[PDB]
Design an enzyme around this catalytic site. Structure first.
Site, PDB file in Angstrom:
ATOM      1  N   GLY A  20       0.747  -1.332  -0.071  1.00 33.03           N
ATOM      2  CA  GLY A  20      -0.054   0.058   0.037  1.00 33.03           C
ATOM      3  C   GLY A  20       0.879   1.082   0.079  1.00 33.03           C
ATOM      4  N   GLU A  21       0.168   2.385   0.083  1.00 37.71           N
ATOM      5  CA  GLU A  21       0.740   3.749  -0.326  1.00 37.71           C
ATOM      6  C   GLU A  21       0.115   4.716   0.572  1.00 37.71           C
ATOM      7  OE1 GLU A  21       0.336   4.816  -4.461  1.00 37.71           O
ATOM      8  OE2 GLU A  21       2.624   4.524  -4.591  1.00 37.71           O
ATOM      9  N   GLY A  22       0.607   6.055   0.648  1.00 40.68           N
ATOM     10  CA  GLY A  22       0.094   7.207   1.511  1.00 40.68           C
ATOM     11  C   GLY A  22       0.846   8.528   0.970  1.00 40.68           C
ATOM     12  N   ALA A  23       0.557   9.487   2.046  1.00 31.83           N
ATOM     13  CA  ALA A  23       1.348  10.459   1.971  1.00 31.83           C
ATOM     14  C   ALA A  23       2.714  10.646   2.674  1.00 31.83           C
ATOM     15  CB  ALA A  23       0.388  11.903   2.566  1.00 31.83           C
ATOM     16  N   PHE A  24       2.656   9.991   3.875  1.00 31.75           N
ATOM     17  CA  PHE A  24       3.877   9.903   4.606  1.00 31.75           C
ATOM     18  C   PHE A  24       4.649   8.642   4.451  1.00 31.75           C
ATOM     19  CE2 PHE A  24       3.593  13.868   6.904  1.00 31.75           C
ATOM     20  CZ  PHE A  24       2.558  14.265   6.879  1.00 31.75           C
ATOM     21  N   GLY A  25       4.379   7.671   3.320  1.00 30.08           N
ATOM     22  CA  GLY A  25       5.266   6.456   3.266  1.00 30.08           C
ATOM     23  C   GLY A  25       4.365   5.494   2.327  1.00 30.08           C
ATOM     24  N   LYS A  26       5.102   4.264   2.079  1.00 32.53           N
ATOM     25  CA  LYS A  26       4.800   3.308   1.143  1.00 32.53           C
ATOM     26  C   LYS A  26       5.111   2.008   1.907  1.00 32.53           C
ATOM     27  CE  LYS A  26       6.060   5.765  -2.733  1.00 32.53           C
ATOM     28  NZ  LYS A  26       7.006   6.689  -2.459  1.00 32.53           N
ATOM     29  N   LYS A  47       7.937  -0.584   6.047  1.00 30.64           N
ATOM     30  CA  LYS A  47       7.496   0.768   5.913  1.00 30.64           C
ATOM     31  C   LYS A  47       8.488   1.686   5.527  1.00 30.64           C
ATOM     32  CE  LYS A  47       4.948   4.382   8.500  1.00 30.64           C
ATOM     33  NZ  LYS A  47       5.717   5.685   8.783  1.00 30.64           N
ATOM     34  N   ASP A 143      -6.779   6.128  17.724  1.00 26.70           N
ATOM     35  CA  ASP A 143      -7.291   5.575  16.574  1.00 26.70           C
ATOM     36  C   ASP A 143      -7.389   4.127  16.718  1.00 26.70           C
ATOM     37  OD1 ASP A 143      -8.174   5.828  14.075  1.00 26.70           O
ATOM     38  OD2 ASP A 143      -6.542   6.458  13.143  1.00 26.70           O
ATOM     39  N   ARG A 147      -9.823  -1.227  11.219  1.00 29.45           N
ATOM     40  CA  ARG A 147      -8.623  -1.179  10.226  1.00 29.45           C
ATOM     41  C   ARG A 147      -7.414  -0.828  10.738  1.00 29.45           C
ATOM     42  NH1 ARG A 147     -11.751   3.645  11.201  1.00 29.45           N
ATOM     43  NH2 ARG A 147     -10.302   5.219  12.295  1.00 29.45           N
ATOM     44  N   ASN A 148      -7.203  -0.486  12.023  1.00 28.93           N
ATOM     45  CA  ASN A 148      -5.895  -0.509  12.746  1.00 28.93           C
ATOM     46  C   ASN A 148      -5.588  -1.654  13.580  1.00 28.93           C
ATOM     47  OD1 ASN A 148      -5.127   1.963  11.563  1.00 28.93           O
ATOM     48  ND2 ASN A 148      -6.213   3.015  13.060  1.00 28.93           N
ATOM     49  N   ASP A 161      -0.686  -0.851  12.857  1.00 32.15           N
ATOM     50  CA  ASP A 161      -1.068  -0.365  11.806  1.00 32.15           C
ATOM     51  C   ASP A 161       0.478   0.230  10.869  1.00 32.15           C
ATOM     52  OD1 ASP A 161      -0.726   2.781  11.859  1.00 32.15           O
ATOM     53  OD2 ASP A 161      -2.111   2.078  13.599  1.00 32.15           O
TER      54      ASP A 161
HETATM   55  C1  LIG Z   1      -0.876  -0.667  18.619  1.00 33.43           C
HETATM   56  C2  LIG Z   1       0.857  -0.149  18.506  1.00 33.43           C
HETATM   57  C3  LIG Z   1       1.392  -0.012  19.764  1.00 33.43           C
HETATM   58  C4  LIG Z   1       1.731  -1.167  17.898  1.00 33.43           C
HETATM   59  C5  LIG Z   1       0.698   0.949  17.640  1.00 33.43           C
HETATM   60  C6  LIG Z   1       0.014   2.154  18.156  1.00 33.43           C
HETATM   61  C7  LIG Z   1      -0.059   3.366  17.378  1.00 33.43           C
HETATM   62  C8  LIG Z   1       0.469   3.413  16.130  1.00 33.43           C
HETATM   63  C9  LIG Z   1       0.361   4.733  15.360  1.00 33.43           C
HETATM   64  O1  LIG Z   1       0.139   5.715  15.935  1.00 33.43           O
HETATM   65  N1  LIG Z   1       0.414   4.338  14.146  1.00 33.43           N
HETATM   66  C10 LIG Z   1       0.417   5.757  13.174  1.00 33.43           C
HETATM   67  C11 LIG Z   1      -0.452   6.574  13.152  1.00 33.43           C
HETATM   68  C12 LIG Z   1       0.184   7.318  11.902  1.00 33.43           C
HETATM   69  C13 LIG Z   1      -0.441   8.739  11.479  1.00 33.43           C
HETATM   70  C14 LIG Z   1      -0.182   9.407  10.291  1.00 33.43           C
HETATM   71  C15 LIG Z   1      -0.298  10.211   9.670  1.00 33.43           C
HETATM   72  C16 LIG Z   1      -1.453  11.196  10.374  1.00 33.43           C
HETATM   73  C17 LIG Z   1      -1.966  10.613  11.788  1.00 33.43           C
HETATM   74  C18 LIG Z   1      -1.412   9.566  12.238  1.00 33.43           C
HETATM   75  N2  LIG Z   1       1.320   7.176  11.823  1.00 33.43           N
HETATM   76  N3  LIG Z   1       1.463   6.080  12.349  1.00 33.43           N
HETATM   77  C19 LIG Z   1       2.765   5.061  12.084  1.00 33.43           C
HETATM   78  C20 LIG Z   1       3.891   5.643  12.287  1.00 33.43           C
HETATM   79  C21 LIG Z   1       5.036   4.775  12.085  1.00 33.43           C
HETATM   80  C22 LIG Z   1       5.007   3.463  12.068  1.00 33.43           C
HETATM   81  C23 LIG Z   1       3.701   2.989  12.312  1.00 33.43           C
HETATM   82  C24 LIG Z   1       2.579   3.688  12.394  1.00 33.43           C
HETATM   83  C25 LIG Z   1       0.963   2.345  15.516  1.00 33.43           C
HETATM   84  C26 LIG Z   1       1.226   1.183  16.507  1.00 33.43           C
END
Ligand SMILES: CC(C)(C)c1ccc(C(=O)Nc2cc(-c3ccccc3)nn2-c2ccccc2)cc1
Length: 288
Positions: A20-26, A47, A143, A147-148, A161
């Site tokens: 998959g894809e997005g604004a902040f990465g692939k 990621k 969140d 989906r997560n 996610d």
């Molecule tokens: C459940 C665990 C602890 C494994 C967890 C909790 C929170 C998140 C998370 O917060 N994900 C998340 C949201 C956004 C995000 C992007 C843009 C706008 C708003 C939110 N990025 N990431 C992200 C960044 C780097 C690696 C993976 C996930 C992940 C796992």
């Protein structure tokens, strides 16, 4: 970002294709060599950061910190060559919302037809187990939604996610002005109205996750626009009992949805009740 690190050589990661894809990465599927002892070759989800660097190190620290039986496994990072990579476990059924929809109104892991009551409860329980761990370390998700979550072989379900849910599931977010996207349909009154987020905003969200599970991944308040959904949530309407959901499970949802945060049941109790049900014999469940 609201709330040691393993390193992987670039040569040990071999990208296969994009997932998959997005604004902040692939995100890619990749073969990772010499990662675990048993498996000399293994699949992983990678990621790739668009390319920022400071956040990455901080997030990587926390991801390494949060490891549990129902949290998506994080193996480490690759900071050798750009772009920077984060390496996670590969979960073959993808995200839980997709999995729910594809077994709602056979195969290796699941029977034909809609998932039975025992399957739905096993799913619910695993996600609850995941949030118990997170609440215990005092981490606020912000969140939580199907989906997560990700579904692996043997229907193992884990929270996690790759930060692209806003891009893949954009209709699940309300764009409030510029660049902020809120999962309003999953949020309690205090998050919408006062913009507060806590362990108990997460129990509420879990309650909505439980409704998603029992509706085979349908969007909460699907009949409403975003503004109409905000109105209903703030005015105190509760989601209706799904057709597949018996009274006792619906009672678990309502305890998650008490208007006052303190009156909500703790995640530990939600889990304990759902486990019991998931581990209950067919004779007891057939009668629920
Ligand atoms: C459940 C665990 C602890 C494994 C967890 C909790 C929170 C998140 C998370 O917060 N994900 C998340 C949201 C956004 C995000 C992007 C843009 C706008 C708003 C939110 N990025 N990431 C992200 C960044 C780097 C690696 C993976 C996930 C992940 C796992």
């Amino acid at each position: 970002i609201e709330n040691c690190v393993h390193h992987i050589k670039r040569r040990d990661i071999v990208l296969k294709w994009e997932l998959g894809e997005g604004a902040f990465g692939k995100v890619f599927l990749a073969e990772c060599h010499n990662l675990l002892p048993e498996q000399d070759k293994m699949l992983v989800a990678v990621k790739a950061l668009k390319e920022a660097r400071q956040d990455f190190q901080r997030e990587a620290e926390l991801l390494t910190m949060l490891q549990h039986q129902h949290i998506v496994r994080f193996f480490g990072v690759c900071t050798e060559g750009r772009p920077l990579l984060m390496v996670f476990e590969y979960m073959r059924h993808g995200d839980l919302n997709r999995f729910l929809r594809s077994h709602g109104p056979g195969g290796e892991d699941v029977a034909p037809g809609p998932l039975g009551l025992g399957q739905l409860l096993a799913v619910a329980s695993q996600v609850a187990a995941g949030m118990v761990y997170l609440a215990g370390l005092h981490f606020v998700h912000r969140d939580l939604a199907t989906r997560n979550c990700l579904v692996g072989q043997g229907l193992v379900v884990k929270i996690g996610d790759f930060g692209m849910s806003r891009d893949i599931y954009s209709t699940d977010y309300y764009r409030v002005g510029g660049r902020t996207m809120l999962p309003i349909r999953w949020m309690p009154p205090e998050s919408i109205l006062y913009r507060k987020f806590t362990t108990e905003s997460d129990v509420w969200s879990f309650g909505v996750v439980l409704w998603e599970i029992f509706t085979y991944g349908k969007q909460p308040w699907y009949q409403l626009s975003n503004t109409e959904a905000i109105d209903c949530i703030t005015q105190g309407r509760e989601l209706e009992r799904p057709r597949a959901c018996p009274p006792e499970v619906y009672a678990i949802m309502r305890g998650c949805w008490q208007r006052e945060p303190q009156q909500r049941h703790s995640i530990k109790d939600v889990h304990a009740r759902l486990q019991a049900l998931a581990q209950a014999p067919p004779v007891y469940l057939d009668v629920l």
